[PDB]
């Protein structure tokens, strides 16, 4: 095979937290364009059972392997190296976009590249004048307030348009020998932090090693925060319907644009402010929109309304629902709480 689209996932659960299975989103984006068999990597921090929840995947064919807790993506790929016998198309589980992924692979294949990433409008990335090849990228660690640009590259690629507010989509079509180098070396614990800067820097190491980086304005990945998932599902209500669909509902209430699926019992006179009606939800009273998160095992009544308050799994809130941006984690059998949007903890 040309590619071997290994997927990375390193830290209730945290990967599949959304309207539909989150890992499915990169898996679906893999399946849209060929990609029968696609390696995956799960962890041990949250559980040695991510795969044990990845058995109902509505996909034709996959492969799964777990690993330990505090293992950097470079370390994970190093571990997985044995079953990686060609080019590699790394990805990340928390990536939800409509990327014309044919494009990045077209870059890598056309220019005979060696690292085709994918970006979308701290990190300063100096891309070339043509908008594609990149020559600089660094964070605020290796530099106080300046940007040392080696003289040779400027004398060889004078125009260098910089870019700052670029959310990396963490896709990285590497090449084989890059991964071989990664396997021999060990002083590297993150491709996105210690290898990719190294490849950029040593691009002028003839048999050079080019490096390209497509840019676009389409859609992002889910970053680390529990917050970004909100706007993720916000855009996704409209994005995913391009392929709700089928559920068990009450069909009486008044509200659209939120998590509308099965595995919940709701009533009427209820709105949906892009909120999270996840698994095992239940609200039977005269509740309203909340623009917040209600995770697994939800329960609320007696005029229930919120404003961004994260209500995690095992949700039981009653006794004068006044919620506002005040996250409360699992074991949420918390009712008499005038929640404020001030500094709150789960």
């Amino acid at each position: 095979m040309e590619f071997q689209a290994v997927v990375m996932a390193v830290g209730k659960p945290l990967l599949p937290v959304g309207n539909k299975p989150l890992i499915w989103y990169p898996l679906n984006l893999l399946e849209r364009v060929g990609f029968e068999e696609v390696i995956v990597v799960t962890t041990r921090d949250v559980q040695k059972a991510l795969c044990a929840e990845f058995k109902m995947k509505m996909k034709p064919d996959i492969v799964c392997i777990p690993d330990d807790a505090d293992m950097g993506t470079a370390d994970s790929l190093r571990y997985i190296y044995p079953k990686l016998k060609t080019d590699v198309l790394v990805l990340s589980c928390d990536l939800i976009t409509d990327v014309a992924l044919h494009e990045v692979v077209d870059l890598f294949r056309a220019y005979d590249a060696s690292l085709a990433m994918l970006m979308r409008k701290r990190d300063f990335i100096g891309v070339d004048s043509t908008g594609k090849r990149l020559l600089f990228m660094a964070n605020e660690a290796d530099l106080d307030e300046e940007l040392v640009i080696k003289g040779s590259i400027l004398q060889k690629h004078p125009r260098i348009r910089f870019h700052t507010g670029l959310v990396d989509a963490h896709l990285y079509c590497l090449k084989k020998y890059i991964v071989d180098f990664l396997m021999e070396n060990g002083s590297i614990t993150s491709i996105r932090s210690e290898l990719i800067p190294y490849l950029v820097r040593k691009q002028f190491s003839l048999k050079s090693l080019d490096i390209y980086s497509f840019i676009k304005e389409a859609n992002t990945l889910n970053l680390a925060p529990y917050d970004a998932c909100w706007n993720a599902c916000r855009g996704d209500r409209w994005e995913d319907l391009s392929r709700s669909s089928a559920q068990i509902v009450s069909k009486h209430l008044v509200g659209v644009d939120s998590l509308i699926g099965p595995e919940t019992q709701i009533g009427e006179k209820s709105s949906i402010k892009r909120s999270v009606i996840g698994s095992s939800c239940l609200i039977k009273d005269r509740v309203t929109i909340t623009n917040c998160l209600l995770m697994n095992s939800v329960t609320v009544e007696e005029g229930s309304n919120i404003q961004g308050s994260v209500i995690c799994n095992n949700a039981v809130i009653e006794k004068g629902a006044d919620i506002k941006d005040c996250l409360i984690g699992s074991g949420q059998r918390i009712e008499a709480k005038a929640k404020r949007v001030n500094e709150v903890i789960v």
Partner: protein
Amino acid sequence: QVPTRKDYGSKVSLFSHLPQYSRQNSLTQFMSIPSSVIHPAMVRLGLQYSQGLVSGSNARCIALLRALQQVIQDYTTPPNEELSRDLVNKLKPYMSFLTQCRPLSASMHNAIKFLNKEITSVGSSKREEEAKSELRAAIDRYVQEKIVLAAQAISRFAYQKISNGDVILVYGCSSLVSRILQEAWTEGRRFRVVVVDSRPWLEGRHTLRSLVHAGVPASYLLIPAASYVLPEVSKVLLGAHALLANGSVMSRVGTAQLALVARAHNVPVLVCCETYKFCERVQTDAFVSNELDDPDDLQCKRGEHVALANWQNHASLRLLNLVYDVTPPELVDLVITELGMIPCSSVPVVLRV
């Protein structure tokens, strides 16, 4: 299946039989990301052709033959299907895909012809490994004895026909003529070189740099100015993408114009080319079998704003830019090959037999 990319813009009437693709919308916009139906090498190759990252004739032939060695080496023989036949029946869709990306020049045509005649000359008395190694070694030897030793003999011939103080003229990019000029300068001949370039793929600058970074005194000028410099020129030395059967050398889109004005001013034209561009076919002019660059690239940034910006909106306006043009065997005086300095009308009688 391998799809067929669309055409681009209304063509010209007399060219309703030719395809006008567009560099922008590559084919693999509608393709499988893992290289499914077409070997990874061939999809990469075609993708870089349709993107114009490989230009010369020898460049295209070598990129192709590298891709073909990549296919043969990473080949798996299907269950009880003969190699001698499954190989060629699998290569046919790749050829159609390349022809879909950028129509195969005469060099790629002769290379494919030889390769198919080569595969279809193996039998069942060979293992997969030995036959595959033989194919790879035969392609290696074909390259080293048709586009590497050939250029050696051609330069060593065209050096004896280059005397001192004679501003040799050339056209655009090429590999054989630049090798000839640099080798003959290394042997001592103190001449000039008058590079003539054209729009829109200004292929003159490639040979310009590859000359001036080797010492020869250059002099670069566009094509509508040939009739200026040809007074003092003393030889023309063109490239040849294809040597047809009548002798009418096909090559880049201006060689005909140059041969004409340089026969009018009476300065002897040459065309140097190896013995593997003898395309067996024959044609009369440059309307029956050409290519078409994406015409949208003609628009020149002269002045403050291009005059062909909204090229399509105007109904009657119809751009084009041919990619090939033909010198009949009358305007041409020399065909240099590894067989000698044969005259241009004795192409089909030595390049064949």
